[PDB]
Amino acid sequence: PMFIVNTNVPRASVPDGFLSELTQQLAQATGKPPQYIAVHVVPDQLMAFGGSSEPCALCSLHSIGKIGGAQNRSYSKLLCGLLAERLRISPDRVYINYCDMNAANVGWNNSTFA
Amino acid sequence: PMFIVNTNVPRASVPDGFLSELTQQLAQATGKPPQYIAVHVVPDQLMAFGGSSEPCALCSLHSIGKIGGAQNRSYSKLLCGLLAERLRISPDRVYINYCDMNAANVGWNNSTFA
Amino acid sequence: PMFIVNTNVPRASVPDGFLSELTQQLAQATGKPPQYIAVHVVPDQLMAFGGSSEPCALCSLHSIGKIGGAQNRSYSKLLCGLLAERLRISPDRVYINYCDMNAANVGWNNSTFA
């Protein structure tokens, strides 16, 4: 799985250990080993949500499976919870795009996961 | 809707008010309330279009609905027109990926839109 | 086609000529003319892969067609090879999301490719 968060919160406001925490919580949430979890945090971005430049986040989770109605509600409670607690971003200023990838459409290690 | 523009135009060339203009015009074009519009502009990027590093933009618009052939043509005229007028990027050096999201696949406010 | 690479490798480790090399090799691999290939490299990123922060890359290739199981394996060999040779990233620390776009869902030059 690949989780990306783009935010206007400054780099200094991202706690040490945030990438590790995302890695662990997403391994637990998706049930995939941590070795397959990739995380990417992009602070200091020029962005707005609803016209406002208060703190916000635009995110995506790409996963081969483990994407669906109930799972995505649970992921959203988890991830909004982490962004609120660690980055002080209100959950209603977060979008997360969930993307269920086909294994043949994910490249890794000179081939695909098919 | 979530609109992202990545460009090699320098930050100083992005005019004040641009994120607001994008928000307002995307709300009108998609019909969505402006409170649901998120916008994100990433200048100073290392990119090329057609092998050339003249000004260009690589963009995406994700939306729950309001994506389709005729709608997307209209969005492209709007968004290319704004990028030409405000960032001086030629329309034929812009790509925009349009992505129709299922409501169950968009997290927001601790849940999803389903 | 649009190819994006996000990486924690520093900007000074991206060699001169890399965006051109990506443009040329992707033109040859997808069979589309280089005038239509866009490329984007984003260095110095805050990211982890598998819980650690040795060099890694999170990438995407969006293309109107020319996406499929065998094609994508060949693209992955090519692109992991380039990232290893030029940015010293291990192929087992690269993820590439392949996305087959409908022509009507790609904006360009004030309209779409439909």
Residue numbers in the entry:
A (entry chain B), B (entry chain C), C (entry chain A): 1 to 114
The authors write:
Macrophage migration inhibitory factor (MIF) is an inflammatory protein with various non-overlapping functions. Human MIF is a homotrimer with an enzymatic cavity between two subunits with Pro1 as a catalytic base, activates the receptors CD74, CXCR2, and CXCR4, has functional interactions in the cytosol, and is reported to be a nuclease. MIF forms a homotrimeric structure with a solvent channel coincident with its 3-fold axis and possesses three putative catalytic cavities formed at the interface between each of two adjacent subunits. Recently, we discovered an allosteric regulatory site at the center of the symmetric MIF homotrimer that serves as a hub for two of its biochemical activities: the enzymatic enol-keto tautomerase and CD74 receptor activation.
To investigate this relationship further, we introduced a cysteine residue at position 99 (Y99C). We hypothesized that this mutation would enable disulfide stabilized dimers within the MIF trimers, providing a more comprehensive understanding of the structural, dynamic, and functional impact of Cys99 substitution. The structure of homotrimeric Y99C MIF was solved to 1.60 Å to probe whether there were sufficient protein dynamics for the Cys99 side chain to form a disulfide and to detect any unexpected effects. The X-ray structure of the Y99C MIF homotrimer did not reveal the presence of a disulfide between any two of three subunits. From this alignment, the residue 99 sidechains indicate the Cβ carbons overlap very well. Interestingly, the thiol group in all three monomers has two conformations in the channel as shown in Figure 3A where Y99 and Y99A are also shown. The closest distances among the thiol groups of adjacent subunits are ∼6.5 Å. The two conformations of the thiol groups in this study do not interact with other protein atoms nor do they induce large conformational changes. Though the shared Cβ atom for WT, Y99A, Y99C MIF align very well, the radius of the solvent channel opening where the three Y99C residues appear is 3.4 Å and similar to Y99A (3.6 Å), in contrast to WT MIF (1.4 Å) as calculated by MOLEonline. Though we observed a solvent channel opening for Y99C similar to that of Y99A, the catalytic activity of the Y99C homotrimers has reduced (55%) catalytic efficiency relative to WT MIF and compared to Y99A (77%). The Y99C homotrimer abolished CD74 activation in vivo but possessed reduced enzymatic activity, supporting the role of Tyr99 as a common allosteric node within two distinct allosteric pathways.
